[PDB]
Amino acid sequence: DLCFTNVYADSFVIRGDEVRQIAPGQTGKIADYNYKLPDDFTGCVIAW
Amino acid sequence: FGAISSVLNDILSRLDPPEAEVQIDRLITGRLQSLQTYVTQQLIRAAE
């Protein structure tokens, strides 16, 4: 029931022992030199 | 007021922004309430 101007789909694969870094306000190798989500990130992190 | 240390540079240096924001926001709540208290005391005393 929500509209959006533009929805982004960022795609990559990682290990289950690193999912926690793909989230707002985290730390680590990924959240340092690979991929960092904003502090006010508004969205969902999905993985299978 | 429920923060870590009552020094802003200390909080900002010790912690990362994702939590410095919370500790700060508590410091801000407290200091703003103290300012309101002082300004209201001044208002009443100036009326007298």
UniProtKB/Swiss-Prot annotation, chain A:
Stated role: Attaches the virion to the cell membrane by interacting with host receptor, initiating the infection. The major receptor is host ACE2. When S2/S2' has been cleaved, binding to the receptor triggers direct fusion at the cell membrane. When S2/S2' has not been cleaved, binding to the receptor results in internalization of the virus by endocytosis using host TFRC and GRM2 and leading to fusion of the virion membrane with the host endosomal membrane. Alternatively, may use NRP1/NRP2 and integrin as entry receptors.
Subunit: Binds to host ACE2. RBD also interacts with the N-linked glycan on 'Asn-90' of ACE2. Cleavage of S generates a polybasic C-terminal sequence on S1 that binds to host Neuropilin-1 (NRP1) and Neuropilin-2 (NRP2) receptors. Interacts with host integrin alpha-5/beta-1 (ITGA5:ITGB1) and with ACE2 in complex with integrin alpha-5/beta-1 (ITGA5:ITGB1). May interact via cytoplasmic c-terminus with M protein. May interact (via N-terminus) with host bilirubin and biliverdin, thereby preventing antibody binding to the SARS-CoV-2 spike NTD via an allosteric mechanism.
Biological classification of the source: Viruses, Riboviria, Orthornavirae, Pisuviricota, Pisoniviricetes
Name assigned to this protein: Spike protein S1
Result after altering residue 29 to N: In strain: Beta/B.1.351, Omicron/BA.1, Omicron/BA.2, Omicron/BA.2.12.1, Omicron/BA.2.75, Omicron/BA.4, Omicron/BA.5, Omicron/BQ.1.1, Omicron/XBB.1.5, Omicron/EG.5.1; May enhance affinity to human ACE2 receptor
Gene that this sequence comes from: S
Effect on the protein of changing residue 17 to N: In strain: Omicron/BA.2, Omicron/BA.2.12.1, Omicron/BA.2.75, Omicron/BA.4, Omicron/BA.5, Omicron/BQ.1.1, Omicron/XBB.1.5, Omicron/EG.5.1; complete loss of interaction with host integrins
Region (Integrin-binding motif): 15-17
Organism domain of life: Viruses
Consequence of changing residue 29 to T: In strain: Gamma/P.1
Protein species of origin: Severe acute respiratory syndrome coronavirus 2
